[PDB]
Short mmCIF file of C-alpha atoms and ligand atoms in Angstrom, two decimals:
data_model
loop_
_atom_site.label_atom_id
_atom_site.label_comp_id
_atom_site.label_asym_id
_atom_site.label_seq_id
_atom_site.Cartn_x
_atom_site.Cartn_y
_atom_site.Cartn_z
CA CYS A 1 6.53 -38.79 -6.75
CA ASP A 2 3.40 -38.31 -5.25
CA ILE A 3 0.77 -35.64 -5.60
CA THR A 4 1.49 -35.00 -1.89
CA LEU A 5 5.09 -33.92 -3.00
CA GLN A 6 3.47 -31.28 -5.10
CA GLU A 7 1.15 -30.05 -2.22
CA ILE A 8 4.04 -29.91 0.07
CA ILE A 9 5.89 -27.69 -2.43
CA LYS A 10 2.85 -25.43 -3.01
CA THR A 11 2.19 -25.08 0.58
CA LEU A 12 5.93 -24.16 1.14
CA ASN A 13 5.61 -21.87 -1.93
CA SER A 14 2.56 -20.31 -0.27
CA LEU A 15 4.46 -19.99 3.04
CA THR A 16 7.47 -18.37 1.81
CA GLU A 17 6.00 -15.36 -0.13
CA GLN A 18 4.21 -13.45 2.63
CA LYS A 19 6.17 -13.26 5.83
CA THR A 20 4.53 -13.21 9.44
CA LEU A 21 5.56 -11.77 12.85
CA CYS A 22 6.21 -15.42 13.85
CA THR A 23 8.44 -16.57 11.05
CA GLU A 24 11.40 -15.17 12.93
CA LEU A 25 10.89 -17.28 15.88
CA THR A 26 13.42 -20.16 15.99
CA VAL A 27 13.19 -24.01 15.57
CA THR A 28 15.63 -26.77 15.58
CA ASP A 29 17.65 -27.10 12.47
CA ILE A 30 17.79 -30.76 11.48
CA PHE A 31 19.63 -30.18 8.24
CA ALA A 32 23.10 -29.46 9.55
CA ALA A 33 22.77 -31.90 12.23
CA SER A 34 22.01 -34.96 9.96
CA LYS A 35 24.58 -37.78 10.47
CA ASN A 36 23.92 -40.56 7.96
CA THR A 37 20.31 -39.93 8.21
CA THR A 38 17.84 -41.28 5.84
CA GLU A 39 15.32 -39.03 3.66
CA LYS A 40 12.54 -40.47 5.87
CA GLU A 41 14.26 -39.57 9.11
CA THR A 42 14.58 -35.91 7.84
CA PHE A 43 11.04 -35.77 6.52
CA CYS A 44 9.84 -37.05 9.94
CA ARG A 45 12.17 -34.80 12.02
CA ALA A 46 11.07 -31.88 9.80
CA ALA A 47 7.54 -32.54 10.51
CA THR A 48 8.33 -33.00 14.10
CA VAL A 49 9.83 -29.63 14.55
CA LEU A 50 6.75 -27.77 12.83
CA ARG A 51 4.42 -29.77 14.94
CA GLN A 52 6.26 -28.56 18.02
CA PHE A 53 6.23 -25.09 16.65
CA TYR A 54 2.43 -24.58 15.88
CA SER A 55 1.42 -26.26 19.08
CA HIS A 56 3.50 -23.91 21.02
CA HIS A 57 2.93 -20.65 18.98
CA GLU A 58 -0.57 -21.36 17.89
CA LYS A 59 -1.94 -19.26 20.68
CA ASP A 60 1.15 -16.84 20.85
CA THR A 61 -0.13 -13.32 20.97
CA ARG A 62 3.09 -11.99 19.47
CA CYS A 63 2.11 -13.93 16.40
CA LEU A 64 -1.31 -12.64 16.58
CA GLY A 65 -1.46 -8.97 15.57
CA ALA A 66 -3.90 -6.29 16.29
CA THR A 67 -4.94 -5.89 12.57
CA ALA A 68 -7.68 -8.28 11.31
CA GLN A 69 -5.20 -9.46 8.71
CA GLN A 70 -2.41 -10.27 10.90
CA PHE A 71 -4.77 -12.59 12.65
CA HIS A 72 -5.65 -14.06 9.10
CA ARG A 73 -2.14 -14.45 8.16
CA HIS A 74 -1.20 -16.18 11.28
CA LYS A 75 -4.27 -18.53 11.18
CA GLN A 76 -3.34 -19.49 7.76
CA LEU A 77 0.23 -20.23 8.96
CA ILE A 78 -0.80 -22.74 11.64
CA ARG A 79 -3.19 -24.28 8.97
CA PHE A 80 -0.55 -24.84 6.49
CA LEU A 81 2.04 -25.77 9.18
CA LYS A 82 -0.25 -28.67 10.31
CA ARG A 83 -0.85 -29.54 6.69
CA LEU A 84 2.83 -29.97 6.17
CA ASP A 85 3.17 -31.86 9.50
CA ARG A 86 0.71 -34.57 8.23
CA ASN A 87 1.99 -34.73 4.49
CA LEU A 88 5.62 -34.90 5.80
CA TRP A 89 4.60 -37.54 8.39
CA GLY A 90 3.02 -39.75 5.90
CA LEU A 91 5.95 -39.51 3.61
CA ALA A 92 8.25 -40.72 6.07
CA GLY A 93 6.17 -43.50 7.40
CA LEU A 94 7.88 -43.46 10.83
CA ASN A 95 6.17 -43.96 14.10
CA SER A 96 8.33 -41.28 15.70
CA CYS A 97 11.78 -39.41 15.46
CA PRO A 98 12.07 -37.15 18.30
CA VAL A 99 14.63 -34.36 17.36
CA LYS A 100 15.35 -33.38 20.75
CA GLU A 101 17.89 -30.34 20.49
CA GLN A 102 18.38 -23.54 16.25
CA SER A 103 17.10 -21.65 13.03
CA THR A 104 14.70 -19.03 11.88
CA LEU A 105 11.38 -20.64 11.06
CA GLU A 106 11.39 -18.82 7.61
CA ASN A 107 14.78 -20.02 6.98
CA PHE A 108 14.01 -23.44 7.83
CA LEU A 109 11.14 -23.54 5.57
CA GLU A 110 13.07 -22.05 2.74
CA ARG A 111 15.78 -24.99 3.16
CA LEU A 112 12.98 -27.55 3.28
CA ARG A 113 11.17 -26.12 0.10
CA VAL A 114 14.65 -26.52 -1.65
CA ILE A 115 14.65 -30.25 -0.96
CA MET A 116 11.12 -30.86 -2.21
CA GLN A 117 11.75 -28.85 -5.39
CA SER A 118 14.85 -30.97 -5.96
CA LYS A 119 12.97 -34.06 -5.01
CA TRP A 120 9.99 -33.27 -7.39
CA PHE A 121 12.68 -32.21 -9.95
CA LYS A 122 14.14 -35.88 -9.90
CA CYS A 123 10.80 -37.34 -10.55
CA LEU B 1 18.26 2.72 17.53
CA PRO B 2 16.97 0.93 15.44
CA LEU B 3 13.36 1.43 14.74
CA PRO B 4 10.79 -1.12 13.66
CA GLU B 5 9.48 -1.30 10.04
CA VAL B 6 5.96 0.23 9.13
CA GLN B 7 3.52 -2.16 7.26
CA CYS B 8 1.18 -0.08 5.12
CA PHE B 9 -1.61 -1.84 3.27
CA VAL B 10 -4.63 -0.04 1.42
CA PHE B 11 -7.62 -2.09 1.99
CA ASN B 12 -10.00 -1.74 -0.95
CA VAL B 13 -9.15 1.99 -1.05
CA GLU B 14 -11.34 2.51 1.93
CA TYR B 15 -8.89 2.98 4.86
CA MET B 16 -5.05 2.32 5.17
CA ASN B 17 -3.60 0.40 8.18
CA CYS B 18 -0.08 1.36 8.82
CA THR B 19 1.63 -0.96 11.44
CA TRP B 20 4.95 -2.08 12.87
CA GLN B 21 6.14 -4.83 15.29
CA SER B 22 5.98 -3.28 18.79
CA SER B 23 6.55 -6.63 20.28
CA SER B 24 10.46 -6.56 19.68
CA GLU B 25 12.04 -3.84 21.64
CA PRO B 26 13.47 -3.03 25.16
CA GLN B 27 10.55 -1.10 26.31
CA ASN B 28 3.94 5.26 22.39
CA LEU B 29 5.77 6.10 19.21
CA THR B 30 5.19 9.00 16.96
CA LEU B 31 4.03 8.84 13.33
CA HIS B 32 3.95 11.48 10.51
CA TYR B 33 3.36 11.24 6.79
CA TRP B 34 3.68 13.35 3.71
CA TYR B 35 3.33 13.20 -0.01
CA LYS B 36 6.36 13.75 -2.02
CA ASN B 37 5.90 16.16 -4.93
CA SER B 38 2.41 17.35 -3.96
CA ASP B 39 0.54 20.51 -2.83
CA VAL B 40 3.82 17.02 6.82
CA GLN B 41 0.96 15.99 9.13
CA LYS B 42 0.25 13.84 12.26
CA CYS B 43 -1.61 10.51 12.49
CA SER B 44 -5.21 11.30 13.51
CA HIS B 45 -6.09 7.66 14.28
CA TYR B 46 -3.72 5.62 16.51
CA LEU B 47 -3.85 1.76 16.82
CA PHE B 48 -2.90 0.66 20.23
CA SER B 49 -1.28 -2.83 21.01
CA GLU B 50 -1.12 -3.25 24.75
CA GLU B 51 -1.60 0.47 25.29
CA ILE B 52 1.36 1.31 23.25
CA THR B 53 1.03 2.38 19.62
CA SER B 54 0.48 -0.63 17.30
CA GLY B 55 0.20 1.61 14.15
CA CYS B 56 -1.85 4.32 12.34
CA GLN B 57 -4.89 4.49 10.14
CA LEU B 58 -5.59 6.75 7.35
CA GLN B 59 -8.98 7.58 6.05
CA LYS B 60 -9.88 7.63 2.45
CA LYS B 61 -9.66 11.27 2.06
CA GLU B 62 -6.06 11.04 3.19
CA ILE B 63 -5.16 8.41 0.72
CA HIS B 64 -3.60 9.33 -2.62
CA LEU B 65 -2.24 6.38 -4.97
CA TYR B 66 0.01 7.29 -7.81
CA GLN B 67 1.52 9.89 -5.56
CA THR B 68 4.75 9.14 -3.77
CA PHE B 69 3.91 8.33 0.05
CA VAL B 70 6.49 9.11 2.87
CA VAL B 71 6.20 8.18 6.32
CA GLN B 72 8.35 9.11 9.38
CA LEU B 73 8.46 7.01 12.54
CA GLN B 74 10.12 8.73 15.66
CA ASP B 75 11.02 8.28 19.35
CA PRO B 76 9.68 10.64 22.00
CA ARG B 77 12.65 10.44 24.33
CA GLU B 78 15.32 10.23 21.78
CA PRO B 79 13.92 12.41 18.73
CA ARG B 80 17.13 12.07 16.80
CA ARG B 81 16.13 8.34 16.59
CA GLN B 82 13.86 8.38 13.71
CA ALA B 83 13.19 6.64 10.35
CA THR B 84 11.65 7.47 6.84
CA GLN B 85 10.08 5.33 4.35
CA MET B 86 8.82 5.78 0.85
CA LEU B 87 5.99 3.73 -0.66
CA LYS B 88 4.01 2.94 -3.82
CA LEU B 89 0.55 2.88 -2.71
CA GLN B 90 -0.82 1.48 -6.00
CA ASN B 91 1.40 -1.54 -5.34
CA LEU B 92 -0.03 -1.72 -1.66
CA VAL B 93 -3.65 -2.35 -2.36
CA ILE B 94 -5.51 -5.44 -0.71
CA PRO B 95 -9.16 -5.67 -1.94
CA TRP B 96 -12.11 -7.06 0.21
CA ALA B 97 -12.86 -10.58 -0.57
CA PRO B 98 -15.32 -10.85 -3.57
CA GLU B 99 -18.98 -10.84 -2.43
CA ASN B 100 -22.55 -11.40 -3.78
CA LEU B 101 -21.64 -14.65 -5.48
CA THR B 102 -24.31 -15.94 -8.06
CA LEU B 103 -24.95 -18.82 -10.30
CA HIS B 104 -27.43 -19.65 -13.16
CA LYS B 105 -27.70 -22.21 -15.72
CA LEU B 106 -27.85 -21.49 -19.53
CA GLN B 107 -23.40 -23.68 -19.26
CA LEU B 108 -22.93 -22.37 -15.80
CA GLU B 109 -22.04 -18.83 -14.96
CA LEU B 110 -20.43 -17.56 -11.82
CA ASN B 111 -20.58 -13.80 -10.83
CA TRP B 112 -19.06 -11.80 -7.96
CA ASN B 113 -18.71 -8.12 -7.17
CA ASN B 114 -16.68 -5.40 -5.42
CA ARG B 115 -17.26 -1.71 -4.75
CA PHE B 116 -15.80 0.31 -7.62
CA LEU B 117 -12.70 -1.73 -7.73
CA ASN B 118 -14.17 -3.98 -10.55
CA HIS B 119 -11.87 -2.40 -13.25
CA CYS B 120 -8.56 -2.60 -11.27
CA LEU B 121 -8.97 -6.21 -10.16
CA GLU B 122 -7.61 -9.51 -11.28
CA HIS B 123 -9.23 -12.60 -10.33
CA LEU B 124 -8.50 -16.33 -9.68
CA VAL B 125 -11.47 -18.91 -9.41
CA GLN B 126 -11.38 -22.22 -7.59
CA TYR B 127 -13.87 -25.02 -8.11
CA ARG B 128 -14.37 -28.85 -7.38
CA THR B 129 -16.81 -31.47 -7.14
CA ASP B 130 -17.51 -34.33 -4.64
CA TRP B 131 -15.44 -36.39 -7.06
CA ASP B 132 -12.58 -34.19 -7.05
CA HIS B 133 -9.44 -34.38 -4.76
CA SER B 134 -7.80 -31.23 -6.01
CA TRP B 135 -8.98 -27.62 -6.20
CA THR B 136 -9.19 -26.50 -9.97
CA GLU B 137 -8.17 -22.97 -10.00
CA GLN B 138 -8.79 -20.83 -13.13
CA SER B 139 -7.40 -17.11 -13.71
CA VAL B 140 -9.78 -14.65 -14.74
CA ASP B 141 -9.78 -11.11 -16.32
CA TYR B 142 -11.18 -8.00 -14.66
CA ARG B 143 -14.41 -8.96 -16.46
CA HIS B 144 -15.21 -11.35 -13.62
CA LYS B 145 -17.29 -13.94 -15.25
CA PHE B 146 -16.61 -17.56 -15.33
CA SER B 147 -18.38 -20.39 -17.54
CA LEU B 148 -18.44 -24.27 -17.63
CA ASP B 149 -23.96 -32.41 -13.71
CA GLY B 150 -26.55 -32.40 -10.93
CA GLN B 151 -25.06 -35.82 -9.81
CA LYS B 152 -21.89 -33.88 -8.80
CA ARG B 153 -21.88 -31.43 -6.07
CA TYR B 154 -20.07 -28.26 -7.13
CA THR B 155 -18.39 -25.71 -4.81
CA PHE B 156 -16.83 -22.42 -6.12
CA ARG B 157 -14.89 -19.74 -4.49
CA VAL B 158 -12.69 -16.90 -5.58
CA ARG B 159 -10.32 -13.95 -4.66
CA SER B 160 -8.90 -10.91 -6.42
CA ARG B 161 -6.00 -8.81 -6.76
CA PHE B 162 -5.01 -5.11 -7.38
CA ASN B 163 -3.13 -5.62 -10.91
CA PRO B 164 -1.58 -4.89 -13.31
CA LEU B 165 -3.72 -2.03 -14.66
CA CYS B 166 -4.35 0.29 -11.65
CA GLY B 167 -1.41 -0.93 -9.87
CA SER B 168 1.34 -3.69 -9.30
CA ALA B 169 0.12 -4.92 -5.86
CA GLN B 170 1.46 -8.44 -4.97
CA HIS B 171 -0.99 -9.71 -2.35
CA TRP B 172 -4.31 -11.44 -2.95
CA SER B 173 -7.67 -10.83 -1.10
CA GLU B 174 -9.12 -13.57 1.07
CA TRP B 175 -10.96 -16.54 -0.17
CA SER B 176 -14.64 -15.40 -0.73
CA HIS B 177 -17.18 -17.54 1.11
CA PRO B 178 -17.78 -20.71 -0.87
CA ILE B 179 -20.83 -20.97 -3.26
CA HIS B 180 -22.48 -24.24 -3.90
CA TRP B 181 -24.25 -26.36 -6.35
CA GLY B 182 -25.73 -29.75 -7.42
CA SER B 183 -27.22 -32.82 -5.55
C1 LIG C 201 -6.79 -2.13 10.58
O1 LIG C 201 -6.72 -1.19 11.85
C2 LIG C 201 -7.84 -1.45 12.49
C3 LIG C 201 -7.46 -1.13 14.01
O2 LIG C 201 -6.58 -2.03 14.60
C4 LIG C 201 -8.25 -2.83 12.67
O3 LIG C 201 -9.43 -3.05 13.40
C5 LIG C 201 -9.20 -3.92 14.68
O4 LIG C 201 -9.96 -5.08 14.27
C6 LIG C 201 -9.78 -6.29 15.26
C7 LIG C 201 -10.95 -7.25 14.75
O5 LIG C 201 -10.58 -8.45 15.77
C8 LIG C 201 -10.02 -5.59 16.82
O6 LIG C 201 -8.74 -5.34 17.28
C9 LIG C 201 -10.78 -4.44 16.57
O7 LIG C 201 -11.97 -4.72 16.04
C10 LIG C 201 -9.97 -3.31 15.81
N1 LIG C 201 -9.11 -2.51 16.68
C11 LIG C 201 -9.55 -2.20 18.00
C12 LIG C 201 -10.83 -1.44 18.15
O8 LIG C 201 -8.92 -2.47 18.98
C13 LIG C 201 -8.59 -3.49 11.22
O9 LIG C 201 -8.88 -4.99 11.41
C14 LIG C 201 -7.35 -3.62 10.36
N2 LIG C 201 -7.62 -3.84 8.95
C15 LIG C 201 -7.17 -4.77 8.45
C16 LIG C 201 -5.79 -5.08 8.71
O10 LIG C 201 -7.96 -5.48 7.56
C1 NAG C 202 -0.02 6.50 24.92
O1 NAG C 202 -0.93 7.32 24.76
C2 NAG C 202 -2.29 6.84 25.16
C3 NAG C 202 -3.33 7.63 24.50
O2 NAG C 202 -2.93 9.02 24.76
C4 NAG C 202 -2.26 6.58 26.76
O3 NAG C 202 -3.54 6.23 27.12
C5 NAG C 202 -1.21 5.74 27.23
O4 NAG C 202 -1.28 5.94 28.67
C6 NAG C 202 0.12 6.29 26.74
N1 NAG C 202 1.16 5.15 27.07
C7 NAG C 202 2.39 5.48 27.31
C8 NAG C 202 2.59 6.65 28.13
O5 NAG C 202 3.38 4.70 26.78
#
């Protein structure tokens, strides 16, 4: 029941409230694909996908709008996504879990935030 | 069919950006607006994303809060393809990040300012020392005054929101440039 857990929930909370242009872009859904997979594996696989997303879409122009605020919104998105990638990776403590091979980013996050809230609820 | 949705925000009641996602579409779109229950016009300032309309901008003279605001997007080739939207602009306000941060001992007091938005705004202040892992955030009234070691190095920052008094707006302004103290 780490402080990280809290931060991960806060970051997810912060991510869900305001939607971006990128949030509709797809990412592999690892929750329905779970076969006897351990919590660590999930956290790891969750992080893995996010890492792949923000590395791919960081420079994406669709995600960067014309407005100065659309730029700012996206900038905090990548920032937060990176934050989660590190926090989630550390919780799993696995050296890697390639997910290979979909879901809406915002839907994925919404599902993830639910797990964390149930985890934090537990402890 | 169908049309994209328009995102309208009023920035510290100076100008208003009205945008939409042009990127999702098969292939210049027209925008008109009017105020319901008042005494239709064309957008005088067009924002272009890739030489096709990104959105529109309304200057202060054209902006009226507490007056029902209505917008109509339309397609030049297929005029019968169009959409209308009604907005509460007092809920759409997003103030600039607080400026002119100041600190003086007395018992430390922090101060920031805005242009004529001071009575509408609601603030949240964050602070930490070199000895702190986490940001300590403290909500503030529209009064905008905060109170509280030279061995510890202090860092303050704050943002504001248009709420509740002048409006119900959800979104927070960006974080003000951090102010420092100590060591
Ligand atoms: C609102 O509308 C205007 C017009 O798009 C925005 O100003 C643009 O700001 C970015 C800054 O990088 C650049 O595209 C140009 O400076 C402006 N547009 C041009 C000339 O192409 C402004 O940033 C928006 N206000 C917000 C959302 O805060
Ligand atoms: C849209 O309008 C602008 C300004 O009038 C013009 O420069 C541009 O060529 C137009 N693009 C089209 C026809 O989609």
